[PDB]
């Protein structure tokens, strides 16, 4: 059986700028443990119906996972824009897979604010699909050089979410799993029952 429990039920989740990928291969995938659950706040599948996944075979499945805030979950979709899609985690326009999210306020908020989860606020260009950028270079926002320090129009590129359990839902932490279903000109290795 494919290890979707290790992905979905991981005690720790990545910051979105440093999003985690798990490759899933050579295993039997029971997707009903996902699509029969009422625990998810977002469950959207592109180019495939979840009620057909148990009948299908893929070359590889990738499971990407991270935390963002509630009102950013809509950015994890083909063709979307915004700080998360542009500078943190980008789906391809042709994406085939499922975007699954749930509220993680109980795990990822702290009284006084949890500042462990970061996102990238500034970048010279947009991420390509499935690109990851974990660099911490000072971002030049103006015309004067930064000399590697924060200062006049020179900003550290990562910002903390600061999740407090008392925030509005749009500002509460959401755990996200993106399942990519890949078809290469190569043998299928991940099949439903």
């Amino acid at each position, epitope marked *: 059986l494919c290890p979707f429990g290790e992905v979905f039920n991981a005690t720790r989740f990545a910051s979105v700028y440093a999003w985690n990928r798990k490759r899933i291969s050579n295993c039997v995938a029971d997707y009903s443990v996902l699509y029969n659950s009422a625990s998810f706040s977002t469950f959207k599948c592109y180019g495939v119906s979840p009620t057909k996944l148990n009948d299908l075979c893929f070359t590889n499945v990738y499971a990407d996972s991270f935390v963002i805030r509630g009102d950013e979950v809509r950015q994890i979709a083909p063709g979307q824009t915004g700080k998360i*899609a542009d500078y943190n985690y980008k789906l391809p326009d042709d994406f085939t897979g499922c975007v699954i999210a749930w509220n993680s306020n109980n795990l990822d908020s702290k009284v006084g604010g949890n500042y462990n989860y970061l996102y990238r606020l500034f970048r010279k260009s947009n991420l390509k699909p499935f690109e990851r950028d974990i660099s911490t270079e000072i971002y030049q926002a103006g015309s004067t050089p930064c000399n590697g320090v924060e200062g006049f129009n020179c900003y550290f590129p990562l910002q903390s979410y600061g999740f407090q359990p008392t925030n509005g839902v749009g500002y509460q932490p959401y755990r996200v799993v993106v399942l990519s279903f890949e078809l290469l000109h190569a043998p299928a290795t991940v099949c439903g029952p």
Partner: antibody, heavy 130, light 111 residues
């Protein structure tokens, strides 16, 4: 970073065929996750949807215009097009091309597609005239 | 198909809240997603709300959308009104037959 650019003839004679083109940049017209459509706006009036298409060839039409409409895709030019036969004065409008929000299935396997416009073009003005 | 009815014209002061309605003449407003498009004079429409309540990136957070099954209407709420919000606003939905646009509301910012 998607940009859409209409091109049209400015003018068409009554009873002739209007042909418009939309050239896409910053995205591929062959994507299976999107529909591409046409919306028009007569002078001083509201919006009207004409038709939408996706590369696989599935098409949706405004039933009141359907019999006069053809819509098509040309992937090598990254274009989609509108044909409106037998035009009348009622067809004088600004015509917009647009890309829809992406199609998807929910957890129950319901399919949502071609439900609203995400990215709009610049508009091309069409005047029906002798 | 069904009609979406909007008020033709509304006026409000800067900093205040205005709510524009969009009433569906038959079938449940919740049966099908509602979008809202903003159009300034001489400009393309831009999408400010999709799937009833979702805001595109680049749309100020004082735009919100909601559905009232009680009046069978969708609403666009603009809080903290700015002079930049003066525009026509169109709601839009659909069913398996066709898309439907509201007739548009012209918003004027007073003062």
């Amino acid at each position: 970073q998607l940009q859409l650019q209409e091109s049209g003839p400015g003018l068409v004679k009554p009873s002739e065929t209007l042909s418009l083109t939309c050239t896409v940049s910053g995205g591929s017209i062959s994507s299976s996750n999107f529909y591409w459509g046409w919306i028009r706006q007569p002078p001083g009036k509201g919006l009207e949807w004409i038709a939408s298409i996706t590369y696989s060839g599935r098409t949706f039409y405004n039933p009141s215009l359907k019999s006069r409409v053809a819509i098509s895709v040309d992937t090598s030019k990254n274009q989609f097009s509108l044909k409106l036969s037998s035009v009348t004065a009622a067809d004088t409008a600004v015509y917009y091309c647009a890309r829809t929000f992406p199609s998807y299935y929910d957890r129950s396997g319901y399919h949502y597609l071609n439900y609203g416009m995400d990215v709009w073009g610049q508009g091309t003005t069409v005047t029906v005239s002798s | 198909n069904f009609m979406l009815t909007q008020p033709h014209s509304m006026s409000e002061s800067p900093g205040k809240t205005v709510t524009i309605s969009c009433t569906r003449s038959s079938g449940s407003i919740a049966s099908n997603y509602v979008q809202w498009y903003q159009q300034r004079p001489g400009s393309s429409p831009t999408t400010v709300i999709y799937e009833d309540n979702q805001r595109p990136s680049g749309v100020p957070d004082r735009f919100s959308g909601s559905i009232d099954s009680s009046s069978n209407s969708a609403s666009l709420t603009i809080s903290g009104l700015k002079t930049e919000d003066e525009a026509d606003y169109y709601c839009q939905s659909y069913d398996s037959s066709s898309w439907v646009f509201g007739g548009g509301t012209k918003l004027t910012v007073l003062g």
